[PDB]
Design a protein around this ligand. Structure first.
Ligand SMILES: [Mg+2]
Ligand SMILES: [Mg+2]
Ligand SMILES: [Mg+2]
Ligand SMILES: [Mg+2]
Ligand SMILES: [Mg+2]
Ligand SMILES: [Mg+2]
Ligand SMILES: [Mg+2]
Ligand SMILES: [Mg+2]
Ligand SMILES: [Mg+2]
Ligand SMILES: [Mg+2]
Ligand SMILES: [Mg+2]
Ligand SMILES: [Mg+2]
Ligand SMILES: [Mg+2]
Ligand SMILES: [Mg+2]
Ligand SMILES: [Mg+2]
Ligand SMILES: [Mg+2]
Ligand SMILES: [Mg+2]
Ligand SMILES: [Mg+2]
Ligand SMILES: [Mg+2]
Ligand SMILES: [Mg+2]
Ligand SMILES: [Mg+2]
Ligand SMILES: [Mg+2]
Ligand SMILES: [Mg+2]
Ligand SMILES: [Mg+2]
Ligand SMILES: [Mg+2]
Ligand SMILES: [Mg+2]
Ligand SMILES: [Mg+2]
Ligand SMILES: [Mg+2]
Ligand SMILES: [Mg+2]
Ligand SMILES: [Mg+2]
Ligand SMILES: [Mg+2]
Ligand SMILES: [Mg+2]
Ligand SMILES: [Mg+2]
Ligand SMILES: [Mg+2]
Ligand SMILES: [Mg+2]
Ligand SMILES: [Mg+2]
Ligand SMILES: [Mg+2]
Lengths: 30, 100, 262, 205, 151
RNA sequence: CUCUCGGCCGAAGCGUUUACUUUGAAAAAA
RNA sequence: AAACUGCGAAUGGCUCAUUAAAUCAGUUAUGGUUCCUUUGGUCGCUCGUACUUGGAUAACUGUGGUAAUUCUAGAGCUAAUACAUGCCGACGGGCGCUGACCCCCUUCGCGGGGGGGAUGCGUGCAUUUAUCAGUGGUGACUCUAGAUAACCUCGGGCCGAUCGCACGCCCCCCGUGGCGGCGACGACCCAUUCGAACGUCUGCCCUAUCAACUUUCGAUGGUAGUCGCCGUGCCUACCAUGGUGACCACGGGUGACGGGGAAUCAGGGUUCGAUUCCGGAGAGGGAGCCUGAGAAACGGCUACCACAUCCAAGGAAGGCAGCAGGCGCGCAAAUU
């Protein structure tokens, strides 16, 4: 359970950080 | 061996106290001559000293070494049966059992 | 007193239990649990006073010890168990499902739900904190602690929990335009849309809500529970949609119902 | 028994107040733990909530930190030299928080000689033992000697600490409360604070 | 020197002033980094607190206190204790039977930080609530405003 | 009410401040 | 059945003696603490006989003492989720420092670089101290999380030698056979629930034939400590001379527990509230404690003060302001 939850949250956190950085980049470029 | 006894007023003897007479002690759990009714209860009780004197109603003795003859009431009687060990390790220790 | 109290006088009980005065001197003191004493509904009150299944307190125990009642999918045998807001009660013997939702009068109502709906509940996020090894933790209004929540979820939001696994499925953010219910105060049991939020540093915040009919009211931020996104609730609502009527129009509705009866 | 309540005190106006309840358990106090220097002796105290307090009655060692070098080591406690609160505590050699004590210097000297590979605390007579010689004059390769020579750039200590190392004892301040946690921990005095306490000690004499 | 007036060394607990450095950086200036914080609620930190060198553990800006609770106001009446003053709060109490009022006052002993100087008797002070600092002190001076006669 | 910065409104300063009055919130049952 | 173990007995019930910014009410705070239990989260995260370890004690069986008690003494047996002691497994490694040695570039060469590495020490969560940088949150942290050097109490933190019900799948196998489902009990630490405890602002009846009070023996504030669950003259040492008061301080009285409320009342108001709900206090008067998460507990213990019971004079045992009931008191109040 610990391993599975850690892996799933790692994937989710990578997704969230990528989304936030992409939105910030779009705001800066415009 | 001198185990204990009671003086003429019926009070028991305690090992620690070194006197010829009675004293009053505050007794708690783990002390002889006292049995608490509640958790943490302590009570003041009268206890006779350990030194043997002439003012004793009864004196307790335990035979440790046997003599030439045997007392007709004490020794010649056959040993009575008693409960056997209940824990498995004690069974093995009593009967010299191996693991197999 | 020298320690915790274990009794509850009947006249000192919460007034939304609707207990009568002459039945006895005492009232069922709720056990410690997910909900507060003044904001819960004991199992015995719901089982004999609301549903009329039992007549005495002994029959409630006889029902409970047969393991017929489930609260949030788990069998509870305690008859004073504190059941609170947005809780699911299942009786598989009769095949019935209920959800504890306030009515417009500020009392818990007997609200039957579909067995499909009984698989999830809504929870209000009370706390967000990082624990050992840098692991986020989220604490809800019903004492549930969930590890590794979504990074976008903050306090005062709403999460949907699947009762079987106890895991978040989705969430609603606390923003103006969402649907909310009041869980305390004078406006308890009302449903509306958030209009604006007033921030008072060092003190309590105030939130303004407007219902479907256009009536506006205000509460503290701690008394607001986000139910749905926009105008669409994520749960089923009781007979009253959350609109509080005045006494005059309650009288008018009662007279109209009486006239059409017979 | 010992009570630390507030209702036995006079009012702000100066008038005395009549109590409305007797002494309560949660207002109790206990006799002070006068911690001396000697072989370790610690007694545990059962406190409110079922928790434990370690009542140190005798202590002789504790771990102190050299902050500038970030070197924390376990060293014995030798003597008490200064006490800001009361000078009777110095006479009876009592270990409390913020008291100034003397500790041994050997572990710090060992770490300094093993890190910078330079002499410290040695007499000018240059007497040596082969173990110390191989600790300082070991045969190292080009890469390791390059790191050690670079470390020798920052190897410099104030005259006060150097003299204390020559004496064999350092001055330290206790930061923990021995009567509450059962251990005497602290830090080595250095900088303006060391000068302040040296001036105080000299003026006391 | 002027700061060190007690038997114990007066230091800011959260600042480490024994960090070793090269001989070139020692010659420049022996300027300790100051510890200060924003207390919140829109109050600004006085420049004397940031640039000062005093030591006060009960100062709202450079000490170990927390401001939470009620924010009150008063007039300075006595400045004779060390780092603490006495202010007076005046109000009117309503008597229902006569439909009128009576004048009443209260006295407060409050802590005054060294960052506030040129404080005279009769000027307005805004204080904030904190944990009990002594037997009778529960408030700390947050702002000082001068009297109407200021020139 | 006021420039500025962000999406006419949002943030920030408001008010020299109160008293007063009208709202609203929180306010055990009996 | 009995007895050992566990839990409860700190709730309830009674009374109103004390108590005049005290209690109490409304309003705030704990970013200054503790918290049995319930609910949820963690519980191979530590790299260092186990196919189950040890010694006793009751109940029981026998022998007794005292005028007397819910007094106990000696002897013979025997258990644990009582009391103790202690492994394996995961365990392959990973990461921080120490680092003999081995390579790859540049250099004629020294020298300037980039890697690999055997051998050693440390390692997880809690505890104490010092230093460094700045995931998530607040109006505000000296917050939470992270890194580094150590420590880690023998009156000793965790890391399961416990119980029940259904019993089945797998192997070169018949074994040391391997695996597996629901529960019960226990436990370090977070969160929650029930609280408790200290604080903030305002508010109380008469009395000046009570006008100055507090500060030797803390009264007001500062610094450092002790003690305490925490904040603080709570206490200690060294210092300053402070703090309160006609806006009534200080003292005295109260046939004074405080409120929710009650009687009378055009509109104002006057008087009452021991009494079933919410807080407080007490158990003949004081004081000191054990146990426990919680008591300065009294249908718990230990003394003194006042009463008072049995006695074979050596001793032993007490607390109805709990339900009935009795004496006394009184104008004044019910069934053992
Ligand atoms: Mg009670
Ligand atoms: Mg209950
Ligand atoms: Mg009293
Ligand atoms: Mg009038
Ligand atoms: Mg009310
Ligand atoms: Mg009411
Ligand atoms: Mg028992
Ligand atoms: Mg108990
Ligand atoms: Mg009764
Ligand atoms: Mg109050
Ligand atoms: Mg606290
Ligand atoms: Mg708990
Ligand atoms: Mg025996
Ligand atoms: Mg045990
Ligand atoms: Mg940290
Ligand atoms: Mg202090
Ligand atoms: Mg002080
Ligand atoms: Mg009275
Ligand atoms: Mg009255
Ligand atoms: Mg009237
Ligand atoms: Mg009239
Ligand atoms: Mg009343
Ligand atoms: Mg009353
Ligand atoms: Mg009376
Ligand atoms: Mg009462
Ligand atoms: Mg009591
Ligand atoms: Mg009584
Ligand atoms: Mg009596
Ligand atoms: Mg008594
Ligand atoms: Mg207990
Ligand atoms: Mg008592
Ligand atoms: Mg009684
Ligand atoms: Mg009682
Ligand atoms: Mg009676
Ligand atoms: Mg009786
Ligand atoms: Mg009558
Ligand atoms: Mg009569």
């Amino acid at each position: 359970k610990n391993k599975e939850e850690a892996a799933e949250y790692a994937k989710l956190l990578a997704k969230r950080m990528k989304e936030a950085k992409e939105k910030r980049q779009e705001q800066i470029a415009k | 061996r001198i185990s204990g006894g009671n003086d003429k007023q019926g009070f028991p003897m305690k090992q620690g106290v070194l006197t010829h007479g009675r004293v009053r002690l505050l007794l708690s759990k783990g002390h002889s001559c006292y049995r608490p009714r509640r958790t943490g209860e302590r009570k003041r009780k009268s206890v006779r000293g350990c030194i043997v004197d002439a003012n004793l109603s009864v004196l307790n003795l335990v035979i440790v070494k046997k003599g030439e003859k045997d007392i007709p009431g004490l020794t010649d009687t056959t040993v009575p049966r008693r409960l056997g060990p209940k824990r498995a390790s004690r069974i093995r220790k009593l009967f010299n059992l191996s693991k197999e | 007193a020298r320690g915790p109290k274990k009794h509850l006088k009947r006249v000192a009980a919460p007034k939304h239990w609707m207990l009568d005065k002459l039945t006895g001197v005492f009232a069922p003191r709720p056990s410690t649990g997910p909900h507060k004493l003044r904001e819960c509904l004991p199992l015995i009150i719901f089982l004999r006073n609301r549903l009329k299944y039992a007549l005495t307190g002994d029959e409630v125990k006889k029902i409970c010890m047969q393991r017929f009642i489930k609260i949030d999918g788990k069998v509870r045998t305690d008859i004073t168990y504190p059941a609170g807001f947005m809780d699911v009660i299942s009786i598989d013997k009769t095949g019935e499902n209920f959800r504890l939702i306030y009515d417009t009068k500020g009392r818990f109502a007997v609200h039957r739900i579909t067995p499909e709906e009984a698989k999830y509940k809504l929870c209000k996020v009370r706390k967000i904190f990082v624990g050992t090894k840098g692991i986020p933790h989220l604490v809800t209004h019903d004492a549930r602690t969930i590890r590794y929540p979504d990074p976008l979820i903050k306090v005062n939001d709403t999460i949907q929990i699947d009762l079987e696994t106890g895991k978040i499925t989705d969430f609603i953010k606390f923003d103006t335009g969402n649907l909310c219910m009041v869980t305390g105060g004078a406006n308890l049991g009302r449903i509306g849309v958030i209009t604006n939020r007033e921030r008072h540093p060092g003190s309590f915040d105030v939130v303004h809500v407007k219902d479907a009919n256009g009536n506006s009211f205000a509460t503290r931020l701690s008394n607001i529970f986000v139910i749905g996104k926009g105008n669409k609730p994520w749960i089923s609502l009781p007979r009253g949609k959350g609109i509080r009527l005045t006494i005059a129009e309650e009288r008018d509705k009662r007279l109209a119902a009486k006239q059409s009866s017979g | 028994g010992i009570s630390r309540d507030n209702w036995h005190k006079r009012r702000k106006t100066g008038g005395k107040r009549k109590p409305y309840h007797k002494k309560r358990k949660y207002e109790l106090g206990r006799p002070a733990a006068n911690t001396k220097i000697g072989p370790r002796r610690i007694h545990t105290v059962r406190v409110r909530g079922g928790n434990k307090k370690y009542r140190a009655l005798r202590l002789d060692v504790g771990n102190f930190s050299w902050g500038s070098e970030c070197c924390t080591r376990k060293t014995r406690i030798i003597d008490v030299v200064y006490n800001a609160s009361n000078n009777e505590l110095v006479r009876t050699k009592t270990l409390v928080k913020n008291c100034i004590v003397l500790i041994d210097s050997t572990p710090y000297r060992q770490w300094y000689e093993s890190h910078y590979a330079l002499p410290l605390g040695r007499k000018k007579g240059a007497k040596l033992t082969p173990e110390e010689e191989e600790i300082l004059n070991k045969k190292r390769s080009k890469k390791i000697q390059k790191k050690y020579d670079e470390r020798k750039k920052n190897a410099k200590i104030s005259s006060l600490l150097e003299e204390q190392f020559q004496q064999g004892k350092l001055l330290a301040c206790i930061a923990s409360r021995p009567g509450q946690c059962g251990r005497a921990d602290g830090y080595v005095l250095e900088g303006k604070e060391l000068e302040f306490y040296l001036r105080k000690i000299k003026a006391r004499k | 020197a002027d700061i060190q007036t007690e038997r114990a060394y007066q230091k800011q607990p959260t600042i480490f002033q024994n960090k070793k450095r090269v001989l070139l950086g020692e010659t420049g200036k022996e300027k300790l980094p100051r510890y200060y914080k924003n207390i919140g609620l829109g109050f600004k930190t006085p420049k004397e607190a940031i640039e000062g060198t005093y030591i006060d553990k009960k100062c709202p800006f450079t000490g170990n206190v927390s401001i939470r609770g009620r924010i009150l106001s008063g007039v300075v009446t006595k400045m004779k204790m060390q780092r603490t003053i006495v202010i007076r709060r005046d109000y009117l109490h309503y008597i229902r039977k006569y439909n009128r009022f009576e004048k009443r006052h209260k006295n407060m002993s409050v802590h005054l930080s060294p960052c506030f100087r040129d404080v005279q008797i009769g000027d307005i002070v805004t204080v904030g609530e904190c944990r009990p600092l002594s037997k009778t002190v529960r408030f700390n001076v947050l702002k000082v405003t001068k009297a109407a006669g200021t020139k």
